Amino acid sequence: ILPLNNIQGDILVGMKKQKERFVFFQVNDATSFKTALKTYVPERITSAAILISDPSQQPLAFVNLGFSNTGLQALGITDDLGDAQFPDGQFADAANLGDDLSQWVAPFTGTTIHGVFLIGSDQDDFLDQFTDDISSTFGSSITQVQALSGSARPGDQAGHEHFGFLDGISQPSVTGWETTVFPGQAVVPPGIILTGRDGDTGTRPSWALDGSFMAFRHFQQKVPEFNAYTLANAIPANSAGNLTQQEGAEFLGARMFGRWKSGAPIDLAPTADDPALGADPQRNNNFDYSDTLTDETRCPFGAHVRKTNPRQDLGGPVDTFHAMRSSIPYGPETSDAELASGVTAQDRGLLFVEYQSIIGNGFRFQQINWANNANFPFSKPITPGIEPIIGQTTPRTVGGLDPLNQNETFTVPLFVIPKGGEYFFLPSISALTATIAA
Numbered sequence: 386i387l388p389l390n391n392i393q394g395d396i397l398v399g400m401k402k403q404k405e406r407f408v409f410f411q412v413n414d415a416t417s418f419k420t421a422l423k424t425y426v427p428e429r430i431t432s433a434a435i436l437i438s439d440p441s442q443q444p445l446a447f448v449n450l451g452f453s454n455t456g457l458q459a460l461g462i463t464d465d466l467g468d469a470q471f472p473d474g475q476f477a478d479a480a481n482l483g484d485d486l487s488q489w490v491a492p493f494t495g496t497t498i499h500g501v502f503l504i505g506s507d508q509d510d511f512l513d514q515f516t517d518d519i520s521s522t523f524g525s526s527i528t529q530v531q532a533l534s535g536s537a538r539p540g541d542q543a544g545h546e547h548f549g550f551l552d553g554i555s556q557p558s559v560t561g562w563e564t565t566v567f568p569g570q571a572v573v574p575p576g577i578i579l580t581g582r583d584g585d586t587g588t589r590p591s592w593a594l595d596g597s598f599m600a601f602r603h604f605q606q607k608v609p610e611f612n613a614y615t616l617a618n619a620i621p622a623n624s625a626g627n628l629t630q631q632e633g634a635e636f637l638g639a640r641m642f643g644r645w646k647s648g649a650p651i652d653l654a655p656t657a658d659d660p661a662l663g664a665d666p667q668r669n670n671n672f673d674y675s676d677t678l679t680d681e682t683r684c685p686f687g688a689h690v691r692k693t694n695p696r697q698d699l700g701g702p703v704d705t706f707h708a709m710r711s712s713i714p715y716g717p718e719t720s721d722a723e724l725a726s727g728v729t730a731q732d733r734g735l736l737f738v739e740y741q742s743i744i745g746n747g748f749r750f751q752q753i754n755w756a757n758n759a760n761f762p763f764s765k766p767i768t769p770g771i772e773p774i775i776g777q778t779t780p781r782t783v784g785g786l787d788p789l790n791q792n793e794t795f796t797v798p799l800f801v802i803p804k805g806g807e808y809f810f811l812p813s814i815s816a817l818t819a820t821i822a823a
């Protein structure tokens with residue numbers, strides 16, 4: 386039985402707030418920081434139990450807190466957490482992920498960052514008040530080195546990312562607590578997500594129980610460029626018949642992601658959007674690629690969702706490589722003038738957050754072994770190629786996007802630019818005060 390009151394809520398449940406701020410900080414004075422932490426944590430750090438409660442019993446903003454390796458070292462927290470990538474930080478790992486290092490920016494270009502406060506709220510006012518509360522509480526014991534702020538997109542684009550696609554449909558469900566499981570949803574032991582729980586094979590200090598590792602990525606997205614590419618390479622026809630250019634461009638976007646913008650998965654809706662399906666969590670995840678293991682008519686081998694969660698491409702259920710996501714878009718809407726020009730003029734993108742007990746099995750496996758790997762999924766009749774959305778191998782060639790000409794390859798410009806990121810550990814709530822602040 387998972388102690389829901391002791392697990393930081395963004396890990397297990399997700400804040401699911403309209404606004405989110407990530408306050409990256411360095412510790413100036415370890416003793417004063419720890420003193421502030423002992424009063425801050427009981428008052429502000431939001432558990433999974435709070436997130437599943439009625440909204441009437443919830444605070445106006447949620448706060449979670451993670452530390453980098455250098456943050457833990459700065460606080461005299463010296464026990465090895467057992468993860469291969471966490472100690473060196475993400476900048477040292479960025480080339481491995483395929484990143485263009487020249488696009489990284491301060492303060493992520495090293496290991497100056499000691500931790501991150503994540504604040505979630507449904508409006509800017511409350512977000513700001515809780516941010517100010519951190520500043521007031523911790524004072525000179527920290528220096529804020531960056532704040533990145535995100536917001537859900539407006540109106541009927543709420544829950545969609547900046548390319549236009551509904552994000553946050555498919556998540557693993559962990560055993561150990563009472564929750565609803567949707568058709569097609571993976572069920573995994575809790576240690577896939579929570580350090581020290583069943584399914585976690587890493588060597589953890591006892592105090593690390595019920596923590597998790599966050600892979601944070603700051604992505605800038607090139608939306609007019611993405612849109613222009615889909616129009617220039619619009620699929621002329623599918624099984625159902627000929628497509629207008631607009632239809633063929635929409636279809637090409639859906640082929641690249643593995644879902645239509647509505648969230649309808651192409652494995653279920655292979656020729657036309659089904660928005661009602663996309664909006665129905667009882668149906669929108671109920672597929673496993675078993676109907677398309679050895680052909681690409683229903684779904685390309687290299688589509689985003691298929692690369693990051695291969696389902697039956699692995700031969701059956703596999704616990705090991707699932708991870709939780711709690712990403713949020715950032716930046717202004719793309720104007721009609723920007724879309725017309727085909728050129729990005731404003732900074733917008735995704736503040737990407739993925740949780741797993743073993744970084745190398747979650748985010749990093751999905752990125753390197755799968756998305757970046759032209760020959761994954763394995764044993765296919767046509768080379769899958771590089772995942773078009775976040776795959777980082779050049780040339781960025783992906784096959785099978787045209788269901789009626791599956792040997793045709795598409796060389797896709799990179800529309801998602803990594804600007805920085807870090808690996809954090811989020812301890813349990815008790816660990817924050819009994820270990821970190823001790």
Ligand code: HEM
Binds near residue numbers: 548550552693739756
């Ligand atoms: C700006 C960059 C990204 C965008 C715009 C994006 C967008 C999306 C969208 C629209 C979905 C479909 C909704 C869903 O199934 O929940 C999705 C699913 C998913 N993405 Fe991403 N994504 C991005 C980066 C990444 C990265 C870097 C990874 C990991 C390396 C990743 C891993 C996943 C996973 C695991 C799923 C769920 C797959 C499933 O269970 O079927 N995404 N993403």
Ligand SMILES: O=C1O[C@H]([C@@H](O)CO)C(O)=C1O
Binds near residue numbers: 673701
């Ligand atoms: O996410 C997945 O869903 C199926 C199965 O677990 C559903 O029960 C599978 O093999 C996955 O990797």
